[PDB]
Amino acid sequence: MLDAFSRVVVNSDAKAAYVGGSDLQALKSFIADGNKRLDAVNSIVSNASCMVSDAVSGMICENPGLISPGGNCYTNRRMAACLRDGEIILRYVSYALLAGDASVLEDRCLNGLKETYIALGVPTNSSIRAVSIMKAQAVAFITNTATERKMSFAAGDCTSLASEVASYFDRVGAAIS
Amino acid sequence: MLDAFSRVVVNSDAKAAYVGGSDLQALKSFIADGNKRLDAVNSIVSNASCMVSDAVSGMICENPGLISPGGNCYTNRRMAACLRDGEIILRYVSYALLAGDASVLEDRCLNGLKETYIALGVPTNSSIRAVSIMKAQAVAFITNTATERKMSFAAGDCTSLASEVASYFDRVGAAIS
Amino acid sequence: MLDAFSRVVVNSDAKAAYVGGSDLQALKSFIADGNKRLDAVNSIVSNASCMVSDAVSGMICENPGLISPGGNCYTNRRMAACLRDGEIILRYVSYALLAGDASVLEDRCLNGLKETYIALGVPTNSSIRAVSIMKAQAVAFITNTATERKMSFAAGDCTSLASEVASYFDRVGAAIS
Amino acid sequence: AFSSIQNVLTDAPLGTPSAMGFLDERTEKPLMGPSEMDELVYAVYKQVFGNAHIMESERAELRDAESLFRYLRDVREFVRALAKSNAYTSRFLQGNQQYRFFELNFKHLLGRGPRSLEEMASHSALYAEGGFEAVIDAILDSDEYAQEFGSTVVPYCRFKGEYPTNEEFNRMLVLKGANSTSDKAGKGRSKLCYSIAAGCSQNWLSMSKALPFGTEKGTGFNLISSSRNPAARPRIGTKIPGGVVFSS
Amino acid sequence: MKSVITTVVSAADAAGRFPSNSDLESIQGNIQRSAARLEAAEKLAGNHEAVVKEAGDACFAKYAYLKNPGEAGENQEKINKCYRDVDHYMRLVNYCLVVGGTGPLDEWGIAGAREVYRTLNLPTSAYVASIAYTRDRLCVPRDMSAQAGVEFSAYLDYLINALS
Amino acid sequence: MKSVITTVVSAADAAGRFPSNSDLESIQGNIQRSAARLEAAEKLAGNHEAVVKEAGDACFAKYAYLKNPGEAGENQEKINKCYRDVDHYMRLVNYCLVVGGTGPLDEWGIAGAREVYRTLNLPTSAYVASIAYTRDRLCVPRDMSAQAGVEFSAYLDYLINALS
Amino acid sequence: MKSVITTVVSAADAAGRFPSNSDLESIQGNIQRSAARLEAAEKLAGNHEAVVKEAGDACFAKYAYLKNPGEAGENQEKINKCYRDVDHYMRLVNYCLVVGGTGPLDEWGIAGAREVYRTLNLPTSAYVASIAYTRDRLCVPRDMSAQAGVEFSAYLDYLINALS
Amino acid sequence: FVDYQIFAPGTVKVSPDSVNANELNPVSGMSKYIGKTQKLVGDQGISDRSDKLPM
């Protein structure tokens, strides 16, 4: 279970070199925006119970046959399990944004998730939507362009970290397809 | 565990007797009044969530040091454990009223309860007070003399069921004293 | 366990009081010289392999009847189980020097220790001498008064840190007494 | 089923990442790697053995059960392979009584104490039909092991809140101790043996040593006796308006 | 009691290890972010009566139905127990800013609160509306510092999230 | 992999918790020590051929009997393999300064090494006499900075306690 | 009651004599000292419900173990008898400032107290912590005058030394 | 019973006794506001019912 400092060394044991002066500038551009990364990951976890519940209920609104009899989010037991699942997806992407490396999401969450949904009949065409709702809601809370909850930040550029957490939602939507 | 018919045959097994017509006239009236025993236990399990929360908060009312710093119903952690415990006690005395013998309350619930409470720090004089409120709540639902919540019964006396369940609530106080 | 900040919180929750302005200069003066707590816990655990070896080898040279047949570190399985048995004593002191409170030393290491050492025939009067040798060696690493391994520190004093850890070795030294 | 001690005052239970890795067709599990692996093996060694303090020349005989565990990532098969070892029968079977061996199987493999004499005598009914391996695989392939631990987590002492007998919580607290406590301190001699066969309970100071930090460990003891009198018939009266009614 | 110190040595004890050179870096973060969370804590200690007087009647200006017969604040003992239960919560918010982690909240205030408040018919949405009133009452240069408002409004919407 | 980031995201995952304020405070300590443990890491990447060539020819100053037949380095072929197993440690000491924790030391260069150095009859006490030659030859006020010295010396002293 | 009058009368009754010139000289001390000790007895008799209840929970702020099971502050009756027994002691100090000696404290509060607080298992260091709190709460110009506070505290630590 | 929801918002007023955990309930049970210990006040034993009538 790696982080972004533990990616440059597992690319360098294969060459068995010392990590010298040339590739150390890529991690000095990690601790430049380290407080920018810490300010960005705090905004997701402060809005996380609203980000899930707006996402799953909008999936019901965009696809109204899900709560028909026979639907996948039909009864109260099934509706609690989809809200349980979207909590775990938003928790594991926020682990990846803090570490700066997708190897917390792809092992602990994405191993076997494609085969489990087809074994349970969970349809992936709605879960590609409900992951992609909170993908677009996460870049609002990072770049402060949300409609409600203008959070307090410092004035700069955060559009690289908003696109970097877009790529972790591309790693979710590739694997459950 | 035993019930009211199994209690008779372990008395006759000490004498190697047969359960004959002298001994059977207690069991022929247990089935004769057996409709009223069922009629009394859904008078209790229909009101069981109101009965627990009134008995626990009615114990807080006569003793406000249970919810001050240093009381053993202080935080949310300790108050939910007290609400869980009074529901367990009311569950096992509804099994014992249904069977007609206090065996299952005495070995599963009450055996070893005094040593848990003097290791966890639970006050036993106020714990007896929460059981003694819901004894008085139970005899008022059975005889249909509660101030709210008149249930629809048939006419006659249930005065031997109301004092049978009052002796089951008295065994809880005798086992933690 | 509680650290040195959570000790102040559980004292004030007994009063149901806010942590005001008078206790905070015991906690702003914890973090003021709080480099030195990190700059001296590193002085123990760098030498902690040699420290447990010189502890029990000086336990032999003042009680030479331990390696006699009948003694408790006679054979080779028992001598390996008291090099390692004083590793755990050295480990939970170095947690408590990092935490500022002896809560993790007393709950996880000192509870029930003498009540097993009489059950195994460990001579507790000679295990006190095992603790107090490495007590003397740890407080001269922090003071930087050792003969060998002059670790280069910054100039000042760690006289209060040398005596906080001497109180931690006297807690284990009085628990098995 | 609320249990005010469990994830509040204790730690969280250790184990493998998930149980969905078995349905993954290109792997067997989230591959932990040998720093994330061996610190889970440290928690199986501290739980199946007590704090036995196994040496370097005793772990070398358990070399084969770890090498299977780091490929087949099942935790239940690792616990089954460690209970049929020589290092499990030379500590808990060789110099002990029969109900001492049985009461440690409930500690090491279930995290609870035995609730009955009828449950305890059925484990000696399995000793007669297959020895000690029939006791161990019947605990491991039980329904109670499946719906609490499974293949995923180490079998830990779980504070449940909704125990099926209250006495089951008492015998769990006597069996585990503090963290400076192994299970060789008695000379054989099952601690729970008198209380299972008679039907009485345990001693309050022996249970409150093993409780966590922050749970009133010992208070509540009146200075009179610690157990109950089964022959006592007290008079407990209720006030009505007129007098006092002794519904006995 | 989850803090920075009581997690790095609850992982050093779970593998049987010494205080690592990893964990001596995590207490160097306790040196840096202390002065924004202590100065947010000391501002709450000298202003507590004012901030829980305004947070409490934000419940009752919003929810006038609570004085109906059978509801939560139906008599003056229950109004006094409502303002007590928001005096407790912001005392734990003051405690979490001293310990530095979310330890004193979720083991004294949050654990059990789903089960306590359901049984006594105390609404969660009235508990949220008092705490969410004082989350956006905070003014960023006026009340405390710039980063001190970040620490104080991190434990507030922790509690809004864990209750909802 | 043992780092300062992987501890606080596996302690959050084990309880099922979002990354709260105590976790984010521990990343703030990694920004403080990065100005010293990276400048010592980049110093070791260019100075290695004068310091791995200082250690092993002074390893044999104390241990003179290792050039004798029947012992380890009886010919010139194995001394050239003796300089491979100390270039394999300074390349792993360099990795743990980069990643912060003890991950590349303990799971690559330490795990298993008690059993290879037992069976293959290699003495561990010449590795302890050679890694510690890079400790006392290291001085601070010419070679590197102040806190780059005490991070490098604390990582040479980790596997001295692991090999002993 | 042990007083100034009853001492000099009993001393001249055991000797069998009339009130001498030295027995009238003692009652003149009862005149010049009555101004201070009746100010303290009137300040106490007007504000006694607020002085008793402020000291009754200073017992439980120091000893929170009294709410544990089997202790002396379990239920509502036991804290009603505890606030009563403190109010009994503050009434007897009001009686001692009026009479002028330790008469009512000796016969009604102290004699027989060691055998009752041990038989009923009431911790006598908690019948002290409420008395010791009141003695240090007193501000010498604010509540009473200078010599009225000397008399008020001297009867307050007579009771402390009689329970200790 | 009054409904209290049919009024205009802002007209139902409520006010606690003290916004303090330690005055509403001390460490002992001697609470003036919470529970059955509200009868243990030094005043409020007698009343003014000579105001009305001899009815």
Ligand SMILES: C=CC1=C(C)[C@@H](Cc2[nH]c(/C=C3N=C(/C=C4\NC(=O)[C@H](C)[C@H]4CC)C(C)=C\3CCC(=O)O)c(CCC(=O)O)c2C)NC1=O
């Ligand atoms: C069928 C019913 C139905 C819904 C429930 C919503 C669901 C929904 N909400 C948003 C859209 C949003 N969701 C949020 C998140 C929040 N908004 C807030 O005011 C809070 C602060 C926070 C948690 C509640 C925000 C801020 C937007 C606006 C776009 C954005 O800024 O992200 C989007 C747009 C995503 C996109 O297309 O990019 C959708 C589909 N829409 C629907 O049609």
Ligand SMILES: C=CC1=C(C)[C@@H](Cc2[nH]c(/C=C3N=C(/C=C4\NC(=O)[C@H](C)[C@H]4CC)C(C)=C\3CCC(=O)O)c(CCC(=O)O)c2C)NC1=O
């Ligand atoms: C590590 C990551 C991780 C996960 C993602 C989940 C994955 C997961 N989901 C479900 C189980 C389920 N998952 C869903 C989810 C959904 N159905 C929908 O229509 C939506 C598209 C979607 C939610 C947004 C439902 C409805 C069930 C219940 C299936 C059932 O009742 O049989 C189960 C089986 C267990 C159970 O049934 O309770 C598992 C393992 N668990 C994990 O451990």
Ligand SMILES: C=CC1=C(C)[C@@H](Cc2[nH]c(/C=C3N=C(/C=C4\NC(=O)[C@H](C)[C@H]4CC)C(C)=C\3CCC(=O)O)c(CCC(=O)O)c2C)NC1=O
């Ligand atoms: C433990 C918790 C913890 C945190 C939450 C953060 C808190 C935090 N964020 C920033 C600091 C900052 N935050 C931003 C971010 C932004 N400004 C914008 O224009 C965007 C809207 C937004 C992007 C998300 C920028 C640009 C800085 C200043 C540069 C920097 O130091 O990162 C700073 C440094 C400036 C200062 O000290 O005042 C700190 C301490 N750090 C911590 O240690």
Ligand SMILES: C=CC1=C(C)[C@@H](Cc2[nH]c(/C=C3N=C(/C=C4\NC(=O)[C@H](C)[C@H]4CC)C(C)=C\3CCC(=O)O)c(CCC(=O)O)c2C)NC1=O
């Ligand atoms: C300090 C605060 C405080 C309280 C909470 C109550 C607590 C309380 N409730 C009851 C007593 C009762 N409680 C109930 C229970 C209910 N009644 C119903 O109609 C509902 C269905 C159900 C939940 C409310 C019943 C049926 C009785 C007894 C019958 C009666 O009240 O006449 C009693 C009398 C028991 C006895 O006499 O010993 C007490 C003390 N009193 C208090 O002083």
Ligand SMILES: C=CC1=C(C)[C@@H](Cc2[nH]c(/C=C3N=C(/C=C4\NC(=O)[C@H](C)[C@H]4CC)C(C)=C\3CCC(=O)O)c(CCC(=O)O)c2C)NC1=O
């Ligand atoms: C089948 C039988 C059966 C029971 C009877 C209960 C008995 C019981 N109660 C508690 C545990 C507890 N029980 C209480 C209860 C109370 N404290 C008071 O002051 C009140 C008087 C009283 C509520 C009415 C409290 C407060 C705790 C928690 C103690 C703590 O947090 O330290 C525990 C410890 C287990 C745990 O919570 O993790 C057990 C076994 N459970 C059972 O399984």
Ligand SMILES: C=CC1=C(C)[C@@H](Cc2[nH]c(/C=C3N=C(/C=C4\NC(=O)[C@H](C)[C@H]4CC)C(C)=C\3CCC(=O)O)c(CCC(=O)O)c2C)NC1=O
């Ligand atoms: C499967 C679920 C199940 C039940 C819930 C009960 C329901 C029930 N109760 C009674 C029947 C009765 N119930 C009562 C009881 C009372 N009348 C009073 O005035 C008292 C308040 C109260 C005492 C508790 C009496 C007196 C009878 C008639 C006597 C009898 O036939 O047993 C009867 C028989 C009369 C009839 O058939 O209408 C039935 C079916 N029986 C069941 O089989």
Ligand SMILES: C=CC1=C(C)[C@@H](Cc2[nH]c(/C=C3N=C(/C=C4\NC(=O)[C@H](C)[C@H]4CC)C(C)=C\3CCC(=O)O)c(CCC(=O)O)c2C)NC1=O
């Ligand atoms: C019977 C046989 C016998 C021994 C094996 C030694 C064991 C021994 N060494 C020291 C004494 C010491 N032990 C150390 C520790 C160390 N010294 C170093 O050079 C290393 C860096 C580090 C690990 C080896 C130090 C520094 C002292 C000197 C006292 C001090 O400075 O603390 C002491 C004194 C402790 C005391 O006074 O209580 C003893 C008994 N002495 C004996 O008589």
Ligand SMILES: C=CC1=C(C)[C@@H](Cc2[nH]c(/C=C3N=C(/C=C4\NC(=O)[C@H](C)[C@H]4CC)C(C)=C\3CCC(=O)O)c(CCC(=O)O)c2C)NC1=O
């Ligand atoms: C968390 C704290 C913690 C501890 C401190 C230890 C405590 C401890 N030590 C031993 C076990 C032992 N402890 C000693 C120690 C000594 N004997 C001497 O002669 C010296 C005076 C002294 C230091 C060398 C020895 C020799 C044994 C082995 C006894 C045996 O093999 O039976 C055992 C029994 C383990 C077993 O074999 O099952 C336990 C629980 N364990 C813990 O979990």
Ligand SMILES: C=CC1=C(C)[C@@H](Cc2[nH]c(/C=C3N=C(/C=C4\NC(=O)[C@H](C)[C@H]4CC)C(C)=C\3CCC(=O)O)c(CCC(=O)O)c2C)NC1=O
């Ligand atoms: C990650 C690991 C980590 C560490 C190892 C320490 C490293 C460390 N120690 C000190 C700093 C210091 N260290 C000492 C200590 C001493 N000087 C002496 O002469 C005594 C022998 C010894 C007492 C034990 C003193 C006196 C200071 C400076 C004053 C202070 O700020 O505490 C400083 C501040 C820089 C400076 O003040 O020069 C740092 C970064 N901090 C860390 O974050």
Ligand SMILES: C=CC1=C(C)[C@@H](Cc2[nH]c(/C=C3N=C(/C=C4\NC(=O)[C@H](C)[C@H]4CC)C(C)=C\3CCC(=O)O)c(CCC(=O)O)c2C)NC1=O
């Ligand atoms: C009881 C039955 C039984 C066996 C027959 C062996 C067979 C065996 N070896 C390995 C596992 C292994 N075996 C080797 C061995 C070698 N690789 C090489 O390149 C060399 C040619 C060769 C040494 C001779 C290595 C290096 C691993 C570990 C692979 C890894 O790191 O993942 C594993 C997987 C378990 C694990 O992950 O460690 C198994 C089952 N072990 C058993 O338990």
Ligand SMILES: C=CC1=C(C)[C@@H](Cc2[nH]c(/C=C3N=C(/C=C4\NC(=O)[C@H](C)[C@H]4CC)C(C)=C\3CCC(=O)O)c(CCC(=O)O)c2C)NC1=O
């Ligand atoms: C240390 C942490 C800590 C807390 C946070 C509180 C939490 C808390 N509040 C209440 C208790 C209560 N809380 C309220 C609260 C309210 N009424 C309303 O109209 C609003 C919804 C809300 C104010 C915002 C009421 C009315 C009660 C009394 C319960 C009842 O009516 O029976 C109780 C029940 C026991 C009691 O009576 O005290 C608890 C555990 N207590 C603690 O010890």
Ligand SMILES: C=CC1=C(C)[C@@H](Cc2[nH]c(/C=C3N=C(/C=C4\NC(=O)[C@H](C)[C@H]4CC)C(C)=C\3CCC(=O)O)c(CCC(=O)O)c2C)NC1=O
């Ligand atoms: C990154 C790892 C690293 C080290 C461990 C040291 C080790 C080291 N020392 C010297 C070489 C030297 N180093 C010193 C320095 C000193 N001699 C002393 O006794 C004083 C205490 C100290 C002053 C600070 C001197 C004087 C020489 C030249 C003499 C010699 O060969 O040692 C060299 C040869 C090239 C050079 O000078 O840098 C190296 C690699 N330098 C490193 O780059």
Ligand SMILES: C=CC1=C(C)[C@@H](Cc2[nH]c(/C=C3N=C(/C=C4\NC(=O)[C@H](C)[C@H]4CC)C(C)=C\3CCC(=O)O)c(CCC(=O)O)c2C)NC1=O
């Ligand atoms: C005129 C002089 C005069 C006195 C000074 C008191 C002295 C006194 N106090 C108590 C009695 C008591 N004193 C306490 C006191 C306490 N409980 C605690 O938790 C704390 C230790 C402490 C509060 C300060 C309690 C609880 C009782 C009642 C004992 C009981 O309930 O058994 C009793 C026993 C009789 C009774 O039940 O009231 C007596 C004689 N009475 C007098 O007539």
Ligand SMILES: C=CC1=C(C)[C@@H](Cc2[nH]c(/C=C3N=C(/C=C4\NC(=O)[C@H](C)[C@H]4CC)C(C)=C\3CCC(=O)O)c(CCC(=O)O)c2C)NC1=O
């Ligand atoms: C009959 C016995 C009797 C006493 C022993 C004292 C004790 C006493 N002091 C205060 C009350 C107080 N006492 C002080 C103390 C002081 N104030 C100052 O100006 C000084 C600097 C300092 C003297 C040490 C303060 C600041 C308060 C108000 C805060 C508080 O409620 O304690 C109160 C609460 C009532 C109030 O004043 O509001 C009481 C009962 N008064 C009495 O009537």
